[PDB]
Amino acid sequence: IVGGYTCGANTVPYQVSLNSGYHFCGGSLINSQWVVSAAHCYKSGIQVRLGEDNINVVEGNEQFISASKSIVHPSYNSETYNNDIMLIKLKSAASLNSRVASISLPTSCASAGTQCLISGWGNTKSSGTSYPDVLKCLKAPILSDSSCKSASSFIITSNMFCAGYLEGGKDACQGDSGGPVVCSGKLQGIVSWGEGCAQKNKPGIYTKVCNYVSWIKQTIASN
Numbered sequence: 292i293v294g295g296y297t298c299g300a301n302t303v304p305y306q307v308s309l310n311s312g313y314h315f316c317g318g319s320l321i322n323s324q325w326v327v328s329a330a331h332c333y334k335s336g337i338q339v340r341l342g343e344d345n346i347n348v349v350e351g352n353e354q355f356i357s358a359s360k361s362i363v364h365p366s367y368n369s370e371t372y373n374n375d376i377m378l379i380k381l382k383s384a385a386s387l388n389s390r391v392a393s394i395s396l397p398t399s400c401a402s403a404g405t406q407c408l409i410s411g412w413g414n415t416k417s418s419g420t421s422y423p424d425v426l427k428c429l430k431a432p433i434l435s436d437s438s439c440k441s442a443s444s445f446i447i448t449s450n451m452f453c454a455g456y457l458e459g460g461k462d463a464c465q466g467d468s469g470g471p472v473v474c475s476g477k478l479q480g481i482v483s484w485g486e487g488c489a490q491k492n493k494p495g496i497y498t499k500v501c502n503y504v505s506w507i508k509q510t511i512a513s514n
């Protein structure tokens with residue numbers, strides 16, 4: 292996260308860190324047994340880390356639980372990131388508590404201008420690299436498709452939305468992928484892609500979760 296702020300320990304209790312020997316992507320707890328993340332974060336041997344703040348220090352509220360099954364969206368396209376969403380089932384249910392908690396799924400989508408909270412342990416520099424230990428947060432509005440497309444010349448689909456600031460300076464970044472975009476109390480986005488970080492006219496692109504709630508619910512019910 293570039294241009295954001297230190298969340299404060301466990302203030303985003305639905306934020307998880309996906310770990311394969313090191314943090315590599317974020318995710319969001321949906322119930323005691325399931326995490327949602329980005330399909331492009333798929334890999335084998337994932338350990339889900341819940342209740343994290345400093346990802347390099349055991350602070351006492353962590354739960355580490357191995358993934359038992361991963362399900363990449365049926366229509367995920369790795370070239371365009373269309374349908375960049377994946378579900379991860381935990382080998383055992385998380386112990387839910389004030390620091391380890393699920394985030395509500397949307398019952399309707401979010402409109403342009405809606406403010407959201409984006410969070411993660413990704414790069415905090417727009418030029419070069421610095422990776423934080425503690426969770427970072429950023430407040431950012433959803434942009435209209437037309438403004439975003441004309442400003443960025445990105446190719447996006449109806450399963451994506453843009454969020455951030457066209458002036459640059461505030462954006463998600465490398466290492467934030469898979470993590471949450473929460474707007475008015477609902478998980479509306481997953482950190483997906485962009486170009487660079489926090490550059491002028493190159494806002495962040497996010498998986499539009501409200502398009503997937505039926506698939507999420509039926510997938511969980513059946514697995």
Ligand SMILES: COC(=O)[C@H](Cc1cccc(C(=N)N)c1)NC(=O)CNS(=O)(=O)c1ccc(C)cc1
Nearest residue numbers: 371372462463464465483484485486487488495496
């Ligand atoms: C490749 O250069 C980067 O550092 C950024 C990191 C990143 C990751 C996620 C979000 C942001 C952001 N600023 N909101 C930045 N990656 C990318 O920007 C994209 N990775 S990418 O190059 O793999 C890629 C590019 C384009 C498509 C359609 C799919 C995948």
Ligand SMILES: [Ca+2]
Nearest residue numbers: 345348349350
């Ligand atoms: Ca920790």
